[PDB]
């Protein structure tokens, strides 16, 4: 295939929305809907200079809409969980444990020191904690604030955590006594009723920004709870308990903390960065995990080596890289009143972006279907024209909704060329983010996953 935002021969223009955000646009294609011309037909270099030099800030700043924001944000919610079962467990880590109310207290007394030093709706701030309590007081305390956290995974080298915080601009950061020194710079605090905020933090406004060059996908609260709420791919409730064992900078981190949090859910907080498959099996019977959110290797590894890592466990849903139907098949035969998930997406559009609950007739197959998109999101497979790819036939992923983030922070091109004008959207202008992911829809209307545009 060949990407008309990457290539085209008509040139390019740049797009914008009523809450100025840019978009490049090839400029053969018809303008979509709630968008206009910003800069003339020109090289795509040239449509690219002038986004780097006029979009100086991703998040949405134009005239005030008719329906005020929708929903509560993430700390609300937890706030209300808090509230409700104070003396329930909401963290496990190792020996310990940490209730709601105790969590609640000490964000909360975290929270009012960080608005002592400067923190407000706009502001970002820096995580550099290991996996613990203090990692959730941490960025629990950057939301109650109004800030927005990003997580600084101190498994990577410190070039690579100095250059991430540099691109969000983060005024400060929040460390430990023994992780001191690491990062320097940047004005730092160390984590020690009190009461929650009301700071005017809204849906729109950022929670956090996400690092697997560093790109840091900058997302609001809603962003957060559209992929978390109202949602049946796995059990939410106050009698579920997480596993938080992925990569806490990523997006998969969400599921296993706020999906637990935003329900009144336990959240066992595995030691160490990485998921430790052997860890994971301990972890499963000590604490009865309802659910495991596992890369499709973790998974197969598990499925073969650790199978006690499913038992008691009620959902497993495998992500990121295509599937392997005989573990998939192995984990159903030896694991019959497990039910299994295939999540999709980009951390762009936060979490998974579609899902697949698994079936019988899928195990007969060779690939696992990446499946249908989440309430309130929704997934394109276009042609190099934008036009919907024939039903059956191979096309680019193209996703869209609730889960979208800001941008890039710090890359408004890279955003532009990547958050595309949607040309299917109402009158309003809507935005879709290009996965470079190809794909085919099929007669039942499931998408399935083919591979990359190379």
């Known amino acids: 295939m060949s990407n008309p935002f990457e290539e085209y021969d008509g040139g390019h223009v740049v797009l914008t929305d009523a809450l100025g955000r840019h978009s490049l646009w090839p400029a053969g294609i018809a303008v979509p809907a709630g968008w206009s011309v910003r800069h003339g037909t020109d090289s795509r ?14 998040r949405p700043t134009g005239p005030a809409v008719e329906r005020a924001p929708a929903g509560a944000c993430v700390h609300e919610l937890f706030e209300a969980q808090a509230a409700r079962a104070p003396d329930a467990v909401a963290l496990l880590h ?27 709706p706009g502001t970002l701030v820096g995580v550099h904690l290991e996996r613990g309590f203090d990692m959730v007081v941490a960025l629990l305390a950057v939301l109650k604030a109004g800030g927005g956290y990003t997580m600084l995974d101190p498994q990577f080298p410190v070039e690579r955590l100095a250059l991430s915080l540099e691109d969000t601009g983060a005024p400060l950061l929040v460390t430990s006594r023994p992780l001191s020194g690491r990062l320097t710079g940047t004005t730092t605090l160390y984590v020690e009723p009190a009461g929650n ?22 997302s609001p609260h809603r962003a957060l709870t559209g992929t978390y709420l109202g949602q049946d791919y796995a059990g939410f409730g106050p009698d579920e308990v997480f596993l938080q064992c992925s990569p806490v900078s990523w997006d998969a981190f969400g599921l296993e903390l706020f999906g637990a949090l935003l329900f009144g859910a336990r959240c066992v907080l595995q030691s160490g960065q990485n998921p430790d498959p052997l860890e994971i099996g301990e972890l499963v019977a000590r604490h009865g995990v309802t659910m495991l959110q596992l890369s499709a290797s973790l998974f197969n590894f598990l499925v073969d080596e650790v199978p006690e890592a499913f038992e008691g466990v009620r959902y497993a849903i495998t992500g990121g890289e295509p599937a392997s139907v005989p573990h998939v098949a192995k984990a159903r035969r030896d694991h019959p009143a497990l039910r299994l998930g295939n999540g999709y997406g980009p ?52 996703v869209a909704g609730a889960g979208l983030a800001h941008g890039y922070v710090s890359r408004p091109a890279l955003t532009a060329e990547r958050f595309v004008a949607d040309p299917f959207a109402g009158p309003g ?16 209307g499931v998408l399935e996953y083919v591979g990359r545009a190379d």
Not at 197 to 218: Q, S, W
Not at 430 to 436: C, D, K, Q
Request: charged letters at 25%; aromatic letters at 6%; one cysteine or more.
């Open 45 to 58: 270099e040239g449509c690219l200079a002038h986004i780097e030099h006029h979009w100086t800030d991703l």
């Open 94 to 120: 190792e020996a310990d444990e940490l209730t709601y109310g105790a969590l609640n207290e000490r964000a909360n007394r975290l929270a009012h020191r960080l608005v002592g030093l400067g923190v407000a």
């Open 197 to 218: 905020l009301a700071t005017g933090v809204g849906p729109e406004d950022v929670a956090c920004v996400m690092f697997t060059r560093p790109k840091g996908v900058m």
């Open 347 to 398: 951390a762009e559009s936060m979490g998974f972006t579609t899902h697949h609950a698994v079936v019988a007739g899928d195990l007969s197959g060779t690939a696992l279907p990446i499946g249908v998109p989440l309430a309130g999101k929704r997934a394109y497979v276009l042609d190099d024209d934008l036009k919907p790819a024939a039903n059956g036939a191979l096309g680019e992923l193209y």
């Open 429 to 444: 202008g809507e935005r879709m983010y290009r996965t470079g992911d190809l794909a085919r829809r099929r007669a039942d």
